[PDB]
Design a protein around this ligand. Structure first.
Ligand SMILES: CC(C)(COP(=O)(O)OP(=O)(O)OC[C@H]1O[C@@H](n2cnc3c(N)ncnc32)[C@H](O)[C@@H]1OP(=O)(O)O)[C@@H](O)C(=O)NCCC(=O)NCCS
Ligand SMILES: CC(=O)NCCCCNC(=N)N
Length: 216
C-alpha cells in the first residue's frame, strides 16, 4: 500500500495503530492555519475535534505523504449519507459551548445547505474532512496528489461523489484546478451564534467557506 510520487515522497494509507504521527502532523501544520481552527479559541483543537478526525482512519480513507519516514502532508476523509445533515446538527448541539461546538455549528450549517445526497440523487458521498501540507512542501501539488488519492479510493468504494468544505481559499483554488465545482458559499461574517456573535473570525484572505464537489 504505497504510491510513489515526486522525489522521495511516498503516499501511504494511515493504518489503525499509527494515528499518533498523523495527529502530530495535523497539530503542527494543519490546525494552526486552518481557518475555522485559527478563527476560534483557544488555538489548539479540543479532544473531540481531534478524535473525530481520527475516527475516519478505520475507513481506509486517510492518507499521508512521507519523506524519510516523516509525514509532510495528510488528508482525512470519510463517508456520509443523506442522514448527515441531521447527524451533524445533533453533534453540533452535543458539543455546543466549546471550540469544537463553534466549529461544528458552522460545518453543520454548511452540511444542511449542501445536502449533497439529495441535491445530486446519490446514495453516499466521500467527504474530505481535513487537508494539510507542511509549509516547506507547499506549492508542489502535494495537496492535489492526496485529493486524487482520495478520489480513487472513493471510486473503489463505489461513491459517486466527493465533497469538501474549502474553509481556505488556497484549498478552493486547488480543487478548482482539479476540476471540482462550487456548490455553496457561506461568508464568515454572515454566520452568528444564538447570542448574535460572529462564530468564526479567520485571518484574511479567507472570507468564506466554499463547498466543492467532484463527480466520480
Ligand atoms: C491548503 C493547502 C494544503 C494547499 O497547499 P498545497 O497543495 O501545497 O498548495 P498548491 O500546490 O496548490 O500551491 C499553489 C500556490 O499557492 C500557495 N499556497 C498554497 N498554500 C498556501 C498558503 N497557506 N499560504 C500561502 N500560499 C499558499 C503556494 O505556495 C503556491 O504558490 P507559490 O509556489 O508561488 O509560492 C495548504 O495551504 C495548507 O496546508 N494550509 C493549512 C491547512 C488548511 O488551511 N487546509 C485546508 C482547509 S480547506
Ligand atoms: C479539507 C479541510 O480541511 N476542511 C476544513 C475542515 C474544518 C476544520 N475541522 C476541524 N477543526 N475538525
Amino acid at each position: 500500500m504505497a504510491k510513489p510520487i515526486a522525489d522521495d515522497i511516498v503516499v501511504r494509507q494511515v493504518d489503525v495503530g499509527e494515528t499518533e504521527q498523523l495527529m502530530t502532523f495535523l497539530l503542527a501544520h494543519y490546525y494552526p492555519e486552518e481557518p475555522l481552527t485559527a478563527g476560534t479559541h483557544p488555538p489548539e483543537p479540543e479532544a473531540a475535534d481531534k478524535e473525530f478526525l481520527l475516527s475516519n482512519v478505520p475507513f481506509g480513507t486517510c492518507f499521508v505523504a512521507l519523506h524519510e519516514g516523516r509525514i509532510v502532508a495528510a488528508v482525512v476523509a470519510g463517508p456520509k449519507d443523506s442522514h448527515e445533515p441531521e447527524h451533524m446538527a445533533e453533534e453540533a448541539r452535543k458539543y455546543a459551548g466549546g471550540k469544537w461546538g463553534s466549529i461544528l455549528h458552522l460545518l453543520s450549517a454548511v452540511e444542511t445547505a449542501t445536502d449533497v445526497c439529495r441535491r445530486f440523487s446519490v446514495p453516499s458521498c466521500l467527504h474530505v474532512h481535513a487537508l494539510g501540507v507542511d509549509p516547506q512542501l507547499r506549492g508542489r501539488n502535494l495537496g492535489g496528489r492526496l485529493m486524487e488519492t482520495v478520489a480513487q479510493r472513493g471510486r473503489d468504494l463505489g461513491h459517486q461523489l466527493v465533497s469538501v468544505d474549502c474553509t481556505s481559499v488556497y484549498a478552493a483554488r486547488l480543487v478548482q484546478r482539479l476540476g471540482y465545482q462550487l456548490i455553496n458559499t457561506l461568508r464568515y461574517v454572515d454566520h452568528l451564534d444564538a447570542s448574535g456573535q460572529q462564530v468564526i473570525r479567520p485571518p484574511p484572505p479567507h472570507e468564506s467557506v466554499q463547498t466543492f464537489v467532484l463527480h466520480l
